[PDB]
Amino acid sequence: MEELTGEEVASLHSEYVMQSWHKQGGPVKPIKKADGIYFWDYDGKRYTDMSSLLVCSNLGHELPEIVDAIKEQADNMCFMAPAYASEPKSRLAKMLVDVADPDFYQRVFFTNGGADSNENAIKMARMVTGRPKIFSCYRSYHGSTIGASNASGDWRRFATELGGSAPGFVHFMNPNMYEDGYTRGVDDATVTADYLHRLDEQLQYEGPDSVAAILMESIVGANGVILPPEGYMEGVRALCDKYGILMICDEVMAGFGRTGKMFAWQNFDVKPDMFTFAKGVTCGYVPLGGVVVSKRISDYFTDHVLQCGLTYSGHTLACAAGVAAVNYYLEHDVCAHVKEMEGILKPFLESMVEKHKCVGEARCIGLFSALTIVKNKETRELMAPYHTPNSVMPQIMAKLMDLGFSTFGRETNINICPPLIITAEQLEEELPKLDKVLTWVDENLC
């Protein structure tokens, strides 16, 4: 082939590619290769993927087991239509029900990504219950297509709402303990009592008989790893039981080992009626998402036609990578390694709280972590208040990117979501870089 130079790759991109969530034509980094927890630009500089790209490359890059499964499947059958059974699609559905809970869940509806599966979970909840309304969090992101974007809490919904908001999407405010003035640990029962009651009250004023589902990120991800107050998720599950509302957990970012469990909702003593997934089901190697449905929902669509579908549902190549990814998580006890890696990451960030005036809070479950950056520790003034213009936080990400610490954040947060295969030696080598950049912020942005 006519292999392109680094400059041509970034040149053509700036000129011909439509970039997500940006204005067109900026400068762009051209990436040549990735492997393990690293990737390289065409100048040869190495970046350590401390955010797993978009918290999706859970097993690092170029994992032989997934790469090999893909190539093997490509030699058999890259795609076969949804109307037919295939080995990878059959095996992955069983594996997913099994790791989720084979006594509660029954079927998996395969999709292309995250927005795709939230869209279909919404449609399925309205069909099963006969009710029109969907409750979702203001502090949440569920996708960019009109249905998932209407359910999404953060301001990316504003553009989708051009022409009008979609009917039946009611938003309720969920607690962000630090930003709301409280202190995790001490105040959990107070915040949980307050926000569970706010939600109960809003349900009553919307008519609980008309609310088909409550949809929640298992742990709010892109918007800052907002660990909920203890007991909050169980109370939501309790409200759903009281009112006949289905509970839908969004596992797109927090699933597949991110938190130390296969699914983040497994940290809570709740069985959601449905939950949605994508990123780590294949570590991003082939697009795949899905909906895991309870036995009750499975039964409903045995009697009624499931009015859902998409050309690539259960894509064969994609599922083959899924089988390899899931088998890797299990055979290599990746959750246990993630729980143990928590022991290096969590104490480190907590000490960044004590050591840095610009770091107000640290949250960490497994390798799912974030820092709240503040302009003023004493007043809790955020370094970038909600939906601020000219947030300085990209500036901070660029200082990090300069040391080979690649990550991202939204609002006033820095995420730290390294690949689940990262080692203690590797963490202890990268985290000093985060401390160095935090010091720069201390001295330049307060």
Ligand X SMILES: Cc1ncc(COP(=O)(O)O)c(C=O)c1O
Closest CA to 272 of 301, 298, 299, 238: 238
* 288 is a site residue for ligand X (CB under 6 A): no
Which residues, other chains included, contact 403 with Cβ-Cβ below 8 Å and sequence gap of 6+?
Answer: 433, 436, 437
* 284 is a site residue for ligand X (CB under 6 A): no
Residues, the chain: 446
* 267 is a site residue for a copy of itself (CB under 8 A): no
Q: How far is CA 263 from CA 99, 108, 147, 219, 318, in A?
A: 9, 15, 24, 10, 20
* 331 is a site residue for a copy of itself (CB under 8 A): no
Closest CA to 316 of 356, 345, 287, 354: 287
- 299 DSSP 8-state letter: H
Return the number of the residue (25 or 385) whose C-beta is nearest a copy of itself.
25
- Longest alpha-carbon distance in the chain: 65
* 361 is a site residue for ligand X (CB under 6 A): no
Residue 87, contacted partner among ligand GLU, a copy of itself, ligand X, none, CB below 5-8 A by kind: a copy of itself
- Collapsing DSSP states into helix, strand and coil, what is residue 226? strand
- 194-223: contacts with ligand X (CB under 6 A): 217, 221-222
* Neighbour-count burial for 131-163, b at 16+ CB within 10 Å, e otherwise: bebbbbbebbbbbbbbbbbbbbbbeebeebeee
The least distance separating a copy of itself from the CB of residue 2, rounded to whole angstroms, comes to 9
Contact between 38 and 286 (Cβ < 8 Å) = no
| 311 annotated ligand-binding residue | yes
- 185-214: contacts with a copy of itself (CB under 8 A): 212
- 270-309: contacts with a copy of itself (CB under 8 A): 278-279, 283-287, 291, 293, 298, 301-309
Contact between 118 and 148 (Cβ < 8 Å) = yes
* 21 is a site residue for ligand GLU (CB under 6 A): yes
| 20 annotated ligand-binding residue | yes
* 60 is a site residue for a copy of itself (CB under 8 A): no
One of 48, 51, 58, 223 touching ligand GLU (CB under 6 A)? 51
Closest CA to 369 of 52, 114, 33: 52
And the tokens for 22?
């940006």
- 97-136: contacts with a copy of itself (CB under 8 A): 97, 106-110, 112-116, 119-120, 122-123, 126-127, 132-134
And the tokens for 363?
């949250």
The least distance separating ligand GLU from the CB of residue 306, rounded to whole angstroms, comes to 9
Residue 217, contacted partner among ligand X, ligand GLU, a copy of itself, none, CB below 5-8 A by kind: ligand X
Return the number of the residue (144 or 357) whose C-beta is nearest a copy of itself.
144
Q: How far is CA 411 from CA 139, 408, 417, in A?
A: 11, 10, 16
| 279 annotated ligand-binding residue | yes
Count of residues binding ligand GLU (CB under 6 A)?
Answer: 19
* 17 is a site residue for ligand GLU (CB under 6 A): no
Count of residues binding a copy of itself (CB under 8 A)?
Answer: 125
CA-to-CA distance for 134 and 142, rounded, in angstroms?
Answer: 13
- 299-338: contacts with ligand X (CB under 6 A): 310-312
| 407 annotated ligand-binding residue | yes
Q: Where are the beta strands (DSSP E) in 126-223?
A: 133-137, 169-172, 211-217
Residue 336 has a CB neighbour count (10 Å cut-off) of 11
One of 278, 370, 374, 393 touching ligand X (CB under 6 A)? 278
- 225-264: contacts with a copy of itself (CB under 8 A): none
Amino acid letter for position 207: G
Contact set with ligand X (CB under 6 A)? 54, 113-115, 118, 141-143, 217, 221-222, 250, 252-253, 278, 310-312
Question: Binding site membership for L-glutamate: which residues?
Answer: 20-22, 83-84, 407
Binding site for ligand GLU (CB under 6 A): 19-22, 49, 51, 53-54, 81-84, 309-311, 313, 406-408
- Known binding positions for pyridoxal 5'-phosphate: 114-115, 279, 311
